[PDB]
Amino acid sequence: SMVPGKVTLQKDAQNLIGISIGGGAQPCLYIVQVFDNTPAALDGTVAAGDEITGVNGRSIKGKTKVEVAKMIQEVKGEVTIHYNKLQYYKV
């Protein structure tokens, strides 16, 4: 595994970093997809299944999925995503 950490991604011309965020099942949030030809893909660090733990230095504990999405979208220019790298099992 890669080590947990953070990456500062430059927003593209569609104001996207190139991830979709999911989770929030009946509190943790996760990357669902990394989109081709986007900053997140170009950088290669983040991956589907990674837990998102923070945005721009701030914890997202107690925030809803949509709150975090709105936060990331609102940021101009570049945004820092803090992530954890979790074990997965292939079955």
Q: Domain locations in the chain?
A: 1-86
Q: Residue 81 and residue 58: Cα distance in Å, rounded?
A: 10
What's the number of CA atoms in the CB half-sphere (13 Å) around residue 38?
19
C-alpha separations of 67 from 7, 21, 29, 44, 53 in Å: 20, 11, 11, 25, 13
C-alpha separations of 9 from 26, 55, 63, 64 in Å: 30, 11, 21, 22
The data reach a resolution, in angstroms, of: 1.1
CATH classification for the domain delimited by 1-86, as one of 1.20.1370.10, 3.40.50.10470, 2.30.42.10, 3.40.50.300: 2.30.42.10
Torsion of CA 90, 39, 43, 32, to 10 degrees: -20
Q: Residue 14 and residue 64: Cα distance in Å, rounded?
A: 24
Q: Per this entry, what is the length of the chain?
A: 91
Eight-class DSSP state of 62: T
Q: Is 63 annotated as a binding residue?
A: no
- Give alpha helix (H) positions in 1-91: 39-43, 65-74
16: amino acid identity, one letter = L
Name which of 3, 15, 18, 4 is nearest 54 in CA terms: 4
